[PDB]
Every structure is written in structure tokens, then in C-alpha cells.
Design an enzyme around this catalytic site. Structure first.
Site, PDB file in Angstrom:
ATOM      1  N   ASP A  33       0.802  -1.202   0.000  1.00 49.87           N
ATOM      2  CA  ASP A  33       0.000   0.000   0.000  1.00 49.87           C
ATOM      3  C   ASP A  33       0.852   1.277   0.000  1.00 49.87           C
ATOM      4  OD1 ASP A  33      -2.175   1.696   0.048  1.00 49.87           O
ATOM      5  OD2 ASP A  33      -2.714   1.292   2.170  1.00 49.87           O
ATOM      6  N   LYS A  88       0.675   8.065   1.618  1.00 48.15           N
ATOM      7  CA  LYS A  88       0.943   8.025   3.060  1.00 48.15           C
ATOM      8  C   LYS A  88       2.285   8.679   3.342  1.00 48.15           C
ATOM      9  CE  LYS A  88      -0.910   3.305   3.510  1.00 48.15           C
ATOM     10  NZ  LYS A  88      -1.762   3.385   4.720  1.00 48.15           N
ATOM     11  N   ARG A  93     -11.238  -1.861   1.430  1.00 51.52           N
ATOM     12  CA  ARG A  93     -12.686  -2.041   1.417  1.00 51.52           C
ATOM     13  C   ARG A  93     -13.251  -2.106   0.002  1.00 51.52           C
ATOM     14  NH1 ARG A  93     -13.751   3.409   4.680  1.00 51.52           N
ATOM     15  NH2 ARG A  93     -11.781   2.561   5.435  1.00 51.52           N
TER      16      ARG A  93
END
Lengths: 512, 512, 512, 512
Positions: free
Chosen positions: C284, C291, C365
Site C-alpha cells: 500500500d 501516506k 474495502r
């Protein structure tokens, strides 16, 4: 009353560490081992020596421990058939292997590891006043003594009602055993160990116990005991006498700021004249330049420099060193409130120079400014050397790391001398850039002689803070100047290390 | 004088909501409808029932409203040919459809929507003391009463000179009409509605009106009225009697901190013994750990826990519940200034445990610590259950959301019981992790029994704050402990909801 | 090259832990102790039992260790006169004391401490394939086996050329010895231990070794071995078949995204039918919602959910459990670049619902959304229960802490059942708020069916992420849904714990 | 197109500065002054010497300028009656006063001020190829030549169509006039000036002109010209030959990474053997650890180290220095995209050691790691000294400031020698902490030999980056290692200074 109990604890402070050697240990303890908990520390080469085989705790379990132990680690056994005063079947023995590798900037005896191995070993000890013998194979007496003292669980503590037992967990009575009679002597090492631990306790005491009044009071009582002169300039007397740096920083606080100066004139010849000045910020809120929470924790430690010089002084007087000494503690609390000195206020330091405040959290250099001028112009003698110590910059860590105090020094030779003293004491230092011509431009003010915080953060900022202090030295001072930034060396694993006094002691011991 | 006008408003506070039922409404109001503004609330199924066709405001316009209205929304009409006391041609009628869907963790009557539909409907009402009849189809009396009370425009307000009219816009006189005689009774619902609204007003009052003195004063006057014992430990009396948590947090403020304890012994049998303790931080600056502006707004609400327990108590006494009750308000202002407790100070709580402060804005748990110990060791009886309520953590929202108070409970059964009480009252809760063995390690201190703020933020932090409070319970307390974190449930659309008292009331009503 | 060596390591993975009991140990090892390194773990009460005195390493040194050892800590001795196969003079014995205290939300056998005590004990072992016997006093077989497996140093590692020896440091061969024949059996515990360690290795493998292709390849080889059906929907096939969530999240990456579905039909008939779905984000970056560095480290672990369900499945098939099982791995890399899905793009998930992306780092999700719909609508059978596992939210830690996976569950009874399974396995969980009516409003979109990231961060955000996934369940699915957020439980002291498979195994084993 | 025009500009680069002395000026220019713009630079003492009165621009206006000029500043006059070739009535004369104060860490001739005074003086010159004579009173030839060269307006520039005139504003032709024949000679100073300016141009060229291909191409053309061997390991050849540091850092970029190694063997025999290695990050995005905009500007300068060593080498070859030399340029672009090396990937450097990436923006040390190993193990000879140069840390500025490159050196004597070379060249350095035992612990990895970014930022972080590079030296290298961090010295007033080549030249020239 918790305060006055902490004052009595400081004033009468004795260490829990004693020093001897293997042969004196053999002549004295003819009833077998004098303890049932034994730590043996040395290098791989030192631990494999035949000499170990004759030590009173040696046995086959211990020999296996020596063969199996890894570098940097301890290996614990229960030793059987080792006679002892308690008549226990077993004696607890920990063997710790110290690395031999040491850089040119480090103490060759690696007291950093000695400390942490001993510290880990002593976590098994709970009971009150338990005898522990630490047999060391290093002969670097001074470094070892410091490492031992700071690791002997004499730390400040208020756990489990210990406020009514001297804020101290008295769990360990420690005996360090060198291979041969040590240099310096046992009683000198004890005085040094006492100073390290007292410094350790002062630094980690909370501000509700150690404030400017209580610290001043400790110094005064020690002054009376040691037969030293002492002078306190308190509160409004600082404003009226022109000490605008220290006064302005401290005036908001509940306890008034103070300049506390102790003097020692030796009985025998004076080989040198030395002034010590220490940053005594008993708590740092940041003032109107308020710190975030994560930077404001551990700011009870902003008096680390004052503790260091106070304890260095105390050592030198007790050892009766042939040096005339002054010790100036710059005591203030940096509080926030209506009468807090402001970002834009213009202060007049005792130097007579005007300072435009552009950061209320560059406060330590303001109080040191007044301290150094006081030391170079307001006292009874003219020092050849001035050492100022402070825990001041978070940039200190970035520059010279957690274990080396940064030193800003105006003389190559004295710098080298001071570095040698750090390596011998194990309280190591490293130089920062000395280049005043570049540093002074960082403090340009459009309305005053100088600002107090650098324009550029990315420009030798530890050095700059040293230069600010240098700017307030008496113009007639032509002597040597050593500025120490010990922010990070003053603590390890979130506990005070007692850093500073032994460094000083070693530097002063070797002046001629 | 604005203060004393707000005190008189609190002390004599009566609600603007009355409760009845359809048949009693029919027998009493034989002059047609008794108002000209009517709200009809029910579900799709409830609104389509034949019974509605007989209600005094029913007419063809209203029938069309019922057919057209969408879920969660209101549909307004002017109803003609509906006779009424004012003899208006038209009657204003709003029909609101409530969803029927409700999760197992929610109140099945969905008072969340009832509240917000009613609230929107009542925005059309300006004039003073206007009669409004709310016909509800739900028979969940308690939940409905709360929803109605908190939506009836009795909020604190200082708009348009209303400081001289009781800080209240008295625009609505509300009548709630259930389908059948309600359980509990009309007069019990009124007492509950009174508590909800008083709590609502206390929470949103600014600190310049509601400070520690004024709050203490309200409690004292209610104490005299209700025939209850009351005890106040104020300011220096807290320091001298060892209440170092609450004292240290509050001592900087202009109004002194106070522990205010009220007691109620029922006339009839005692089925249980319960202690309530509430966080009464009348304002939170953050102290030396200062909050940014965007986090410091709404911090007049940091006394939400004390208001909740005060109003729960008041309800229980007025309903003469068969439970012996103490109610301890932990009143302090967390101010910033020279005598502010510091990040590094070590406090001695009444528990006798030492706390190293590493965040001055984890203050509520300090005052609750002293509160809970007081409740478990310093009062006249030994409670079986202790409930502490606080608006404490911004992490509460992250964990359990805006409408469910987080509950940290030391007994599965009492937790379930407390959850059932939230579902019936519509003041819903959800559990947080109970696991003391993991939480206690977050407060490790190198110099005191514990720190007050977690080392890791990412580790069940609502639970940890509950555990800190648990750490200061009397060691002999073996009873049930319920810690409620109601930070977000205490306000909605930037206005206080009056959350807490009805939750308590329902929990206490059902103890055996 | 290093990749195919890591694939071979996974495909042929065997554990280094074996299980037995005291009596079977005694009948087999008649030459005394079968190792010369011994760990004895139990509680204070368990360690003081007479039964210990008859164990083959017991001796007076060991007895003293038992008397002196502190709770949570180990105490090492060299034991003399103990019969052993090697006939060494001494045997190394470590005694570890486990706390007996365990909350209702925790495993009573406290494998958390068992693990960390064992882990510390095994740091003394360097040499290759060294035999170590761990005698445990707890009979909680399953929990213990997991604790042992994850502590046995079979971790992923590329230190010191270990890339050519299977990315594994083979230093320990471990034998766990229970007091009595364990339930479940030795060979079942070995399969469980194998799964835990394989999971541990998959999670801490770097993405340059474990990407979507290599993970898919492992699953395929295991599929062939176990006789299981397997299906892969790769890259453009996902776009063309309408899997717009998983496709859009993964399409920027160098290795294409894939839905990998494994099936198992048991030999015995079974009513019980279960679908597992796992978040397989192999890395990720955050995508366009990048991030910061300090949050992006450990993001190789964003495939933790897929590893968990893959290893749960593998266990269940090897144990031939009487449950029909599907296992869907949602494999993608969340990369940054020109074809990265954008904040504002509108995706069409397989559910047929449109999603406005307002955060590219709420990606798990999205892939789970397509996974769960695939599992409830596109496979050969209709599951009664769906479990989706993901390491998704940094808020998980805030909510339920480091050791309790947060569970969002649509059925109170199944939730309790799943909690019981966490307590028995020691892979503990705790519920988060189930209240869809509140959660769905957080995903309001003005241009699509929903957004993917909450409007308010402080509103039950772990629950909301669960609800998002629930929104993409097939409309005809009426079964039980368990959503597990295991972000923090998946790692401890910055190493993967192998969390998840044993939880699943225990839940599945006890389906009625 | 613009690229190949910038390549031609670099390949054929000649300086605009010439050097002579007063007496040679007098014998050659017998028509009076050879320019009509004159700068006279010296100290207060130097400018007041009788010798000035005989210089060809001296006159009463100039004498008044000398009396009035302030320290650090220039004072301009129009001088009348001064013999000149153009026979103008007036000659423009600027007098600049240099401070005499210089710290022990600084160049006594204060070229810092000489540079900035000259720079200011030359802002009046616009026209093409205008002759300017700079008479200097300092005899520190080398320092002066550097100061002059970097101040002579040969900077990179694309203003006003200058892309078609070599990206250069040819406004000044400069003649520096010393008091006496300089040492080193005029033609050696010209080569040095040429190197400084070429370095200056390479550093401030934008990456769209200077990328890894174009830089490699410059080096190759210079290689052919100078008769030097050259070797390029490009792109996939780096992956296949095990250069996993430099390959992984650069592989995302549009232009492939390259290791470019140049060799020089002198005509004369020499014992002295030196390897130079330079960080050639042509642009730094930060990679997945993306920098904010305000830190990412000036990151075209992350190839400063490679330019420095390339230009040092070029000087040494043109001067035919008696030292065998290799020069390794570590060329890469640190780009962001799908194939960007990740935070968590594990790289295998050429050293054979594994590196866990925990910050993609600590990339320079990765490429240097492969560079230094290549230099100590893969080339034709064994260097006695290795110098690696890099512009790497924003912490460099914090540590050693804007004008002193930080040096991490493994040998006290060579460090002093390298410092002396900085003081003579005026490209000054200062040491950072050398203490490998403390630094190595900052790079602990749980899955690989080491991490690449420090765990603690506040722990001698310039030193730590040096240590990382040291970790990848060939194990058989026993020679001296000098690591130079020149981040801030490489630019001043937001323009490249050409720092590095003259430092090197001076160090190499004085190897004994």
C-alpha cells in the site's frame, strides 16, 4: 514538606558504592564470598584469563558461562560449592561480556556497556540494602566508578510511598572489585560516585520538589558544610542590578530567579583559576513560545547544566584540588502567564548589550549570558578558563548524538584537553564548529544589538547558541572558553545519567 | 449578576413539556383542538393505521400528507375544517415519518429521528409560549420523553437580550400525546424531561456563567430543597486533605476546585447502594499541554459528566427510588498560568499512589481518580456499584461514534444491564475493551507509580483512560464498576443533547 | 530468482515444532533429557506443584529458580546432575512464570506472555537446528501451540545470505511437552503451527518477493497439492467482467490484480457452508492519497487478511474439517502513477453499485467489496457465514488495541461464538459497534451511490469500514457476516505474529 | 536538442578568468590600465600600504574610497586622470574591504567575503565580454582563484534566449592581479577556475538538461579528450551484475541509472593511489517517501557530489598530478511511479549485504554503497584513500552550517590533512562524530542485514549516513576513508557555488 524531605536527602547524600581490589578482598573476606549476588564484567580476552580461575566465585558453572556468553550480553548462573557468609547453597553469578572495540572518540573501557550490563543485572535485586559484589576486569577506574554509580539504583523515585524513605529505593549496597589497587584511590572514586548520583537525583527530581528556592537552598547548605563562600542574587535584586536576561526569563514564575555563586580558594598553591557556569532552568514551559507536550516532557531536566557544575565543584572541593574555583548557578523557571517576557521585548543583559527576544524558548542562553558576564566581570578573580554547561538544544542530538556532548571551544588545545577528559571519565564529548564570524550574523536585529534565536535553523545551530553566550563575555576576558551542550547525554532510557561532574573532575584534575 | 440570574434559572428549573394520551386528550379538550400547531410522528405502518383517522386534526390534507411523506422527513400542511380553541381557519400540521429499522445496539423507537424531526418542526415557532401538540404513535414512553425534552427549545441562549429572561427562549409549550396512557406515568416523564433539559442547559452554559463556584452553588441549593446531605471540600482543604489530583488540576484557576458530594437515603427499603462520580471540568484550556483553537471550542462541555450524574441523582431523589445514592461532582477548571501543574510534576492522589504527569490535558482522569477513591473509601457507605461519567476522549468518537457512549465495565452482566438501559432510554452505549492486564502497561513511569497519559495512542485508548481511573479505586472495593465516556453523545449539531441522566435513571430504576 | 526461491520456500513449508506430553516423553527418552536446553513455563501455582519435582530436568538449582523467578520474567540456571543423552555436565534450564490473571476478554492461559517468555529464552540459541524442549504446565493446547510456533524463529529473514537457504534461520528444533496427552492431538497442533508460521512468513515477506503474481502462484500450487479447485480472475479479465473495485485499485501496479478463489468440498456430508474473503493488498503506497513515510513502513503487511484466510483454509483442508469452504483472496498492489485511480473517479463495483472515491487509501474495502459479492453471488454454493479479514485501519488500534482484532458482526450469537474462538486460540477479538443505520450516512455521495471514505473521522470509523463492505453483499445473502480488522494484532515488536488462521480454525472446528 | 546544446557547452567549457601579477601587468600594459572597470580587494591593513599608491588606478578619489569604505562592503568611485588604453576620462573603481578576522576553522584569506564583494561589484556589468581587472592584496592564490571563478557570472542560465548561446551570459572577461607571481602558477589557477565553474554549471543545470544519460555522455567525451579509461554499467546490466542499491533507486526513472568509472594512471611513477566516489542523484523526488514542495526545490543539486569528484578528477588529470586515480559517478534519478523501490523492499547491494528500505529518500547512501564497494573491490587497483562526496542530508546544515561541509573520517591524521586542504582552498570542512559502535545500532533490521534510515533522527544523523556507506566497503579495504557531506556548501544565495573540486585538488596536491 515533601520538598524539605528531598532537601535533607540532597544535603546529606552518601553513595551506595565502595571500591576495592581482588587481593584486599581476599585478605578481608576469609569467611568465603561476602555476598550472594555476584557480577563479573570484562572483555572476551579479560574473561578468558587464568587469573579469573582463582577468584572466590569461580566454579564449573561460571566457567561454562564465560565460554557461552555473547558480546554485549549477560549470562546468569547459580554457582554451587562456593562458600559464603550467608551460608546459601547457591550463589547467583552474572557474567557480562564487554566489547573491546572503541573508536578514537570513545572511552576504550566502553563504560556505556558496563553501565547497561550492570543495570540489567541489578534488576533482579529487590530486597533492602542487598550486598552485591561487582568484579571488573577493566582498570579504567574513573570511568568504571561513574558507570557503577549511575547504575546502582540510587535514582530519584516516588514509587510505592518512597517519598517518606528519601525518594530512593535503597535496594543495593554495591562493592566494585578491580584486579589491582585502583588509581585514583577508593576514597576518590567514592567522592566521584557520590557526585554522579547526586547529579542524577537532582536532574530527575520533579520541579514541584526541585525549584529555584530548593536548589539554592541545597547549594547554600553545601556551602556552609564545605567552608565555601556563597552569594545569592535573588528576584528583584536581579532586575535592580541589571541582570535583565536571567530576571526577564524567570520573573513570571512562582519561585523567583536567582544567581547563586560559590567560591573555593585552595589552602595550597593555585595552579589555575577556573569559572564554572551552569544553566539552571528548573522547568521549561517554553514561555509564550510554548512547546508541544511531546517536547515539554523531560524539561525538568533543563537544569542539568547547573547540576553538573554544582556537582563538579563539590567533587573538586572534597578532593581539595589545587585550583581556585567559582561556580555560578543560573536558576530560573521559564513560566507562562501575564508577566512573561515576550517575543519582541528588548532586554538589557548585564553585559549592557540589548537583546530582542524572537523566541522565549531560547531562554537558557539568556540566563547563561548573565552568568558568564557575572563570572568574567563581577567576581573576586579573573579566570583563565570558563566552562559553561547547559542542556539546551534538541539539535545537539542531531549534531553529536545521544552519548557525546557537543563542545564549542575557542582554543584548539583546551578543546583537545577537554576531549581527553571526556574519554577518561567516559562522559564523552565531540566538537562543534567554532567560527564566530559566521555565527554572529544569525542574530542580526533591526532594533537591538542582537536577537536570541537564529534566523536560519539549518546553520550550525548548536554553535550559534554557544556564540550567543560568548557575545556576553566581559570584553576584557582573554581566556579560554568551553561551552558544553549536554541535552541528550544527561539521560538514557528515560532516566538521568548524572552526566557532567566526572567530565569536569577529570578536566580539572589534569590542569597545570 | 448574569451569573446569579443563571443560578436562579437552574435552581427553580421547570420543564416546558407535558404528557398525556389520546383518550384523555379527547375527554379534556371538548372545544376542538387545544393548539393550532400539530406534529404527528410515527412509522410508515403506524401512520397508515385506521386509528389516526379519528384524531382531532385528521382531515383530507393530512391524509394526503401521510401518503406522500418520505422516511426521515416531515411533510407540512395547512388543515382546514378542524375546529380549534383559537378559532383559526387553518391548523398547521406537520407529519413526520420515523424509520422502523433499528439495530440490536440501538433504541427500536429511533428517538434519534423523532428528536431531529420534532426539532425541525419547532423551528417555525417564534412567538412566546406557543401551544404545540405532538401526537406520537410510539409507546416507548421514556425514550420519547427525552427526545421531546431535548428538542423543545429550552436550550441555553444569550441571543437578543435573553440574559434578562432566564437565558432561555420560551417559545414553545409542548404537549406530547401518546396513543394510550404511558408507562411510566406523565408525572415521571415530566421529572425525566426536566432533568434532560437542565443537563442540556448546564452543558452549553459558558464558563463565565457556570464555573466551579456557581455549579457548587446549584448543587447546594438543590440539596437543601430535596432534603439531601451535601459536603464540599474546597480549594486548600483539598491540598491539605491529600486530594492531589483534583487540587493540582484546578489550583491555577480563578475559582477554586471542589469535591461536592450529595447523599440520599430512601425512606423505604434499600434494594442497592450506588455511587455516581462525575468529571466536572467547567473549562479545559489543556493547561501547559495547550489545545489548538479548533479542539478548545466546545470545552465548556468538559463538565458533561458532572451534569449527567447530578441530574441523574436529582431524578432518582424526586422519583423516590429505593436505592441509597451518593453523587460526587469533581469540579475544576484546567487553566494555564504560573501555578499550573506541570508536565513532569508528580502528584499524590488521595489513593496514596503517585502520578507522573506527562500530559496536563489528560486531567479529567486525575479528578475522577480522586472522586472514585472518595466514593469507595471516604463516604458513609460501601457502594455495590460505582458509575463514573466523563466527557474525556476525542478517541471516544473514533471508537464508538457520535451516538453511543463508550463503556468500560468490570462485569459482563452489569454491562449488559447498562446497555439495556441505554436502549430503553434512547441514550445508547457500546462497550469498549475491558482488559486491565494490557492497559496498565501504557502508564509505566520510571519515577512514580504511574503516568497519566498513554505511551501509545494506538492501543485501546478509551479503555486505558477508564483503567487509569480504576487504578485509584479503594483496594477493598470488590463491587461493580462502570466507566462511561460520553464526549460526543453530549452534543449534536453543535448543541448539548442533555445525554446521561435518563440513561442513569433507567439503569437505576431496574436494579433489584 | 529470489522470488521463485521464496515461492519454493512457501510451497514446501514445514514447521519446526513438535508436540507431546510428559509420560510419552518419559517412555521414549530413556537416556534422560533429549536436549540440553530446557524451558519450563507455568504459573506461580503450577510451578510450585509436586508434579514438577518428578520431571527429568528438576534439581535443586531449578527449585531455587522457581522460588526466585518474577511474574512475567524468566530465570536461567545451569542444572547439574541431570540425566541427558549428550551426557553433558550441565543442562541449560530457563524457568518462566506466567501470570494467572486474565480478563473475560482474554485467553485464560495468557499465551501473550508464554510467547514473549519463550521468545526471550530462544534468543540464546544461535547454532543450527538446536534441540529445545519446552515443558508447559498449561493444557490449553491450541493457544500454546500458536504461541510456540510464532516464537520459534521461523520468521522471514534475508540476513547473512539466508536468501539461498529459504529466507529462514533454521536455529531451533522445538518440542513442546504438555502435562498430559493434548487435545487437539499432536499432529493437529503441528498442522496449526505450520499454518501460523506460514502466515507469519507471508506477512513479513517484502513486496519485491511477495506480489500479486507470486502470492497467486503459492495458492495455485497449494491448490494442486491439496486436491482443491482454484480459479483466478486476472487483470483485464477483472475490468471486463465488472470487478471495478479490485481492478481500479490494482491497475496501476506492475503486477496485475487478481481474484483467487479456492474451494474445498469435504468427503463426509456436511450442512455447514462457509466463505472466507481476505484483503490482499501486497503493498500500500496510499495511491494518490500518498501516506507519509512513517505510516507507509510495514505496509507489506496490508495482505495480512489474505494470508490469514489462506492459512485458515489450508489448515481446515489438511484437518479434513466437515465444512464446505471457499477462500477468496483479493490481491492487488495500491501503486502511484499516471493510471492510478483518482480521488473523484467513479467506480462500478461488481455489486453494480457506484462508488465515488474520496480517498485512494481506503482501498482495502474496495477490493473486499468485490470479494464479498463474488463470494455471495458468483460461486457454486450459498454460504451460511461469511468472514472477511483485513488489516485496514490505523483506527483499529485506537478502538480495540494491539492484541484484540476488532469485529463488526451482524448477529449477536455468532459474534459471541467468534469471540469464544479468539479466547481459545489466544488470537483474541473484541466487538466494534454494529449500527448500519448510523454508518451508512458517513458515505453519502452527491454523484454516486456512495463514497468510500467517511465524512467524519471521529464516528465509529472501524465500524464504518465494515459497513462499506457489507453494502456490497449480494442482496439475497441472508446469512451471518463477520468482518475482522486485524491491523495491529498481525504484528508485535515489529515482526509478524501470524495472527488469524488459528482464530478461524477454532471458530470453524466448533461450528454446530 | 537543448540537451545536446548543453552537452556541447560542458564538453568544450573554458573559463573567463585569467591570472597575473602587478609587475607582469606593468610590463605588458604600457598604455595604462587595460580595462575601464577596476576592483581592488584587500584588508584594512593591506589597503593602507604604500604599495597601493603605485598601482595604475590609484588617484585621490581612490584614496578617499579607501579611507571611507566599511568592512565587508564596497565603495565605488569614478577615478579621473588615470592612464588607460581606451583613453576614457574616467575609470570605474570599486574598493572592497575584506575582514582580517578568521577562526582556526576558516580560510585566513576570507574568500567568502572576496566572493561576495566581487559578486556585488560585477552586478554593474551587463555588456558583452567586458574586461574587468581585479587587483587583490591576498597571496592565497588558490582560495582567491576559486572565489573569483565562482563569482564571474559564468553560471548556468536560460534567461533571454541564452539556450542558443551555451546557457551562459558572457558579460565578464576577468583578470585577477596578485601582488606577486602566484603560487600555484597562472595556468594552474586557470585549470582550477575552469573546474569550479564547470561544477557550478553542472549543479544548477535543470534535470531536463542534465540527466543520467547526458551526465554520462559528458564524462565519456572528457574521458576521450583526456586519454582516460572509462567504463559504464548501465540499467539492466546493474541489476544482472548485482548492483541492487543503485539499480533499485534508479529503475523507475525514464533515464536508466549508471555507474560511470574513469581511470587515470600518471606518466611518472607514484606510490599514491586514490579513489573518488560521488553521489549522482540528477533529481530527487523522494520516491514513495515524497518530499514536500519546499524541500524538493533545489533537488537538481543532489548530483553535487558527482560533479565535485568529476571536476576534481578533471583538474588532477589536466595538472598531470602524480597520483593514480579512479572516479566513480553514481548516477540515478529517484523517481516516483509503479516500479519505484518501496519502503519495505529488501535490496541486495553489491557488497552482498541485504538492506531493508524504511525510507526511499535516504537513497544517496544506497547508490554510494554500491559505488564505494565497486571502488574498493571491482577496479584495477587498491586505493590507499577513498573519498566519497555527497549532497545528502538537510541535517548537514544543522550540524556544520552553510559553509562547512561535514566530514566523517576513519583516521584522525587524514582528517586533519583534509581540513588543512579545505582551509587553503577556502572550501572549508568540519568533522562530524566518528563512532561506528554507536552509529550501526541505528540501522537494526528485523528482516535484513540493515535498514537505510536511522531509527532516531536526533542521534548524530550526518555521521550515521556516513556509517551506512562505510558498511558496504570491501572487507579487505584497510585504507583511509573520507566521507564528505556538502549539501549546503554547494549553494549560496540560491545559486551553485561549484564547491568540492578545489578542496579535492588541494588535498590531492599535498598527499605525501
Amino acid at each position: 514538606s515533601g520538598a524539605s524531605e528531598f532537601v535533607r536527602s540532597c544535603v546529606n547524600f552518601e553513595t551506595n558504592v565502595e571500591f576495592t581490589d581482588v587481593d584486599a578482598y581476599k585478605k578481608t573476606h576469609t569467611a568465603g564470598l561476602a555476598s550472594t549476588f555476584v557480577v563479573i564484567l570484562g572483555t572476551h580476552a579479560q574473561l578468558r584469563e587464568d587469573a579469573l580461575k582463582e577468584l572466590p566465585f569461580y566454579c564449573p558453572a561460571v566457567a561454562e558461562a564465560i565460554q557461552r556468553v555473547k558480546k554485549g550480553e549477560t549470562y546468569a548462573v547459580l554457582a554451587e560449592g562456593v562458600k559464603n557468609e550467608a551460608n546459601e547453597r547457591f550463589v547467583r553469578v552474572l557474567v557480562g561480556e564487554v566489547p573491546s572495540e572503541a573508536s578514537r572518540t570513545n572511552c576504550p573501557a566502553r563504560p556505556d556497556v558496563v553501565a547497561s550490563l550492570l543495570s540489567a543485572a541489578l534488576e533482579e535485586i529487590k530486597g533492602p540494602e542487598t550486598k552485591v559484589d561487582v568484579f571488573v576486569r577493566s582498570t579504567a577506574a574513573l570511568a568504571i566508578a561513574v558507570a557503577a554509580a549511575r547504575s546502582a539504583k540510587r535514582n530519584f523515585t516516588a514509587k510505592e510511598g518512597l517519598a517518606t524513605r528519601g525518594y530512593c529505593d535503597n535496594c543495593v549496597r554495591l562493592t566494585v572489585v578491580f584486579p589491582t589497587a585502583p588509581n585514583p584511590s577508593p576514597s576518590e572514586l567514592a567522592v566521584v560516585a557520590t557526585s554522579t548520583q547526586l547529579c542524577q537525583r537532582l536532574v530527575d527530581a520533579p520541579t514541584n520538589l526541585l525549584n529555584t528556592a530548593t536548589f539554592a537552598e541545597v547549594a547554600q547548605s553545601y556551602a556552609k558544610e564545605l567552608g565555601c563562600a556563597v552569594d545569592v542574587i535573588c528576584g528583584e535584586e536581579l532586575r535592580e542590578r541589571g541582570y535583565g536576561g536571567i530576571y526577564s526569563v524567570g520573573k513570571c514564575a512562582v519561585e523567583a530567579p536567582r544567581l547563586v555563586t560559590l567560591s573555593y580558594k585552595p589552602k595550597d598553591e593555585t595552579r589555575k583559576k577556573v569559572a564554572l557556569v551552569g544553566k539552571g532552568i528548573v522547568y521549561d514551559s517554553g514561555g509564550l513560545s510554548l512547546k508541544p507536550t511531546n517536547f515539554m516532557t523531560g524539561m525538568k531536566r533543563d537544569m542539568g547544566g547547573a547540576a553538573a557544575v554544582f556537582c563538579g565543584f563539590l567533587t573538586a572541593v572534597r578532593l581539595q584540588m589545587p585550583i581556585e574555583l567559582s561556580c555560578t548557578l543560573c536558576l530560573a523557571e521559564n513560566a507562562i502567564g501575564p508577566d512573561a517576557y515576550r517575543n519582541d521585548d528588548i532586554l538589557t543583559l548585564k553585559s549592557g548589550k540589548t537583546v530582542e527576544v524572537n523566541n522565549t524558548d531560547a531562554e537558557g542562553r539568556l540566563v547563561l549570558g548573565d552568568g558568564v558576564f557575572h563570572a568574567t566581570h563581577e567576581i573576586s578573580f579573573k579566570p583563565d578558563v570558563l566552562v559553561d554547561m547547559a542542556t539546551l538544544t534538541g539539535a545537539q542530538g542531531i549534531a553529536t548524538g545521544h552519548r557525546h556532548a557537543g563542545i564549542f571551544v575557542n582554543d584548539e588545545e583546551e578543546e583537545l584537553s577537554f576531549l581527553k577528559a571526556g574519554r577518561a571519565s567516559g562522559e564523552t564529548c565531540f566538537p562543534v564548529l567554532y567560527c564566530p564570524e559566521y555565527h554572529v550574523t544569525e542574530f542580526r536585529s533591526p532594533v537591538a544589538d542582537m536577537r536570541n534565536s537564529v534566523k536560519q535553523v539549518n546553520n550550525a545551530s548548536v554553535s550559534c547558541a554557544g556564540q550567543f553566550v560568548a557575545n556576553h563575555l566581559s570584553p576584557d576576558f582573554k581566556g579560554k572558553h568551553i561551552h558544553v551542550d549536554m541535552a541528550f547525554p544527561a539521560f538514557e532510557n528515560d532516566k538521568a545519567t548524572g552526566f557532567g561532574p566526572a567530565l569536569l573532575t577529570e578536566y580539572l584534575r589534569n590542569l597545570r
